[PDB]
Design an enzyme around this catalytic site. Structure first.
Site, PDB file in Angstrom:
ATOM      1  N   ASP A  39       0.846  -1.187   0.000  1.00 37.60           N
ATOM      2  CA  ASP A  39       0.000   0.000   0.000  1.00 37.60           C
ATOM      3  C   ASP A  39       0.899   1.261   0.000  1.00 37.60           C
ATOM      4  OD1 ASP A  39      -2.219   1.901   0.962  1.00 37.60           O
ATOM      5  OD2 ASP A  39      -3.271  -0.025   0.616  1.00 37.60           O
ATOM      6  N   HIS A  69      -3.667   5.760   4.304  1.00 37.12           N
ATOM      7  CA  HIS A  69      -4.403   4.618   3.766  1.00 37.12           C
ATOM      8  C   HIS A  69      -3.743   3.301   4.159  1.00 37.12           C
ATOM      9  CE1 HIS A  69      -5.760   1.794   0.516  1.00 37.12           C
ATOM     10  NE2 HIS A  69      -6.918   2.314   0.872  1.00 37.12           N
ATOM     11  N   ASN A 161     -14.267  -0.189  -5.839  1.00 35.05           N
ATOM     12  CA  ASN A 161     -15.291   0.695  -5.298  1.00 35.05           C
ATOM     13  C   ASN A 161     -16.134   1.340  -6.390  1.00 35.05           C
ATOM     14  OD1 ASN A 161     -14.024   0.415  -2.564  1.00 35.05           O
ATOM     15  ND2 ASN A 161     -12.379   1.464  -3.639  1.00 35.05           N
TER      16      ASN A 161
END
Length: 279
Positions: A39, A69, A161
């Protein structure tokens, strides 16, 4: 064990019904396992990681999480208050910049790095990788994820998403890795969560409180928050010896809460991550 007043996602994956507030789990808590969080990095200095987090690779001028995040996902895997596998080891591979962006060629490199670097680390209960990331379809990205899985690592990736079919996103659309959809505290499919036959499991992903950079905490939403639940869970089940890196996604689906989510479209699995812990 029981964590009183746990976050709703932690209570959910140890419960048979929504609306509870305790996270029930075996005290091993993932000791002996390892989860690579691929990430924006991790703030290993956060007291919630208890020194169990450490950065092992970056592709940018810094290895620090200038976003939060990655720190948020790592806290859901193994932070003491917000994580599923509270005694697991977290490794940080920073493939995303501090805007959360990253090129495909860098993400691939990151995945190849984890397949090799697990051989440098002591993980006698196995290895997990959490990829709360993705984009448009790419077969090179999908191969990368499948290479990581085949090398002995449990790969969990966010489904997306876009409230669309995950067949058109990567690495979400790689069949051999665990592709995680998102639900909310009322067992509804998250409004944003992708769907489609490529999904394997759902995890909590709407209003997820977890760690944040600056030694802080906040609640955010995304299939990025669902993925580390399943990754934490995988590592928890592997420490217990109930499954292996190669078999965990299938195990999690076999042992999941079946048919309890709403707004699950036809063709998409209706399975919610669940640890079946019996005190």
């Amino acid at each position: 064990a029981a964590q009183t007043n746990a976050p709703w996602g932690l209570a959910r994956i140890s419960s048979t019904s929504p609306g509870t507030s305790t996270y029930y789990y075996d005290e091993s808590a993932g000791q002996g396992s390892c989860v690579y969080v691929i990430d924006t990095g991790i703030e290993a200095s956060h007291p919630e990681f208890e020194g169990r987090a450490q950065m092992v690779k970056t592709y940018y001028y810094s290895s620090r999480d200038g976003n939060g995040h990655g720190t948020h996902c790592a806290g859901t895997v193994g932070s003491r208050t917000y994580g599923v596998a509270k005694k697991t080891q977290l490794f940080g591979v920073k493939v995303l910049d501090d805007n959360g962006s990253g090129q495909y060629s860098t993400i691939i490199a990151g995945m190849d790095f984890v397949a090799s670097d697990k051989n440098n680390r002591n993980c006698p209960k196995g290895v997990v990788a959490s990829l709360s990331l993705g984009g448009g379809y790419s077969s090179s990205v999908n191969s990368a994820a499948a290479r990581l899985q085949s090398s002995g690592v449990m790969v969990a990736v966010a489904a997306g998403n876009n409230n669309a079919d995950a067949r058109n996103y990567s690495p979400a659309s790689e069949p051999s890795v665990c592709t995680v959809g998102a639900s909310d505290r009322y067992d509804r499919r998250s409004s944003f969560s992708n769907y489609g036959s490529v999904l394997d499991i759902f995890g909590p992903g709407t209003d997820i409180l977890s760690t944040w950079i600056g030694g802080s905490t906040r609640s955010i939403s995304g299939t990025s928050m669902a993925t580390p639940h399943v990754a934490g869970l995988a590592a928890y089940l592997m420490t217990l010896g109930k499954t292996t890196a190669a078999s965990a996604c299938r195990y999690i689906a076999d042992t999941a809460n079946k048919g309890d989510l709403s707004n699950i479209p036809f063709g998409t699995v209706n399975l919610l991550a669940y640890n079946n812990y019996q005190a």
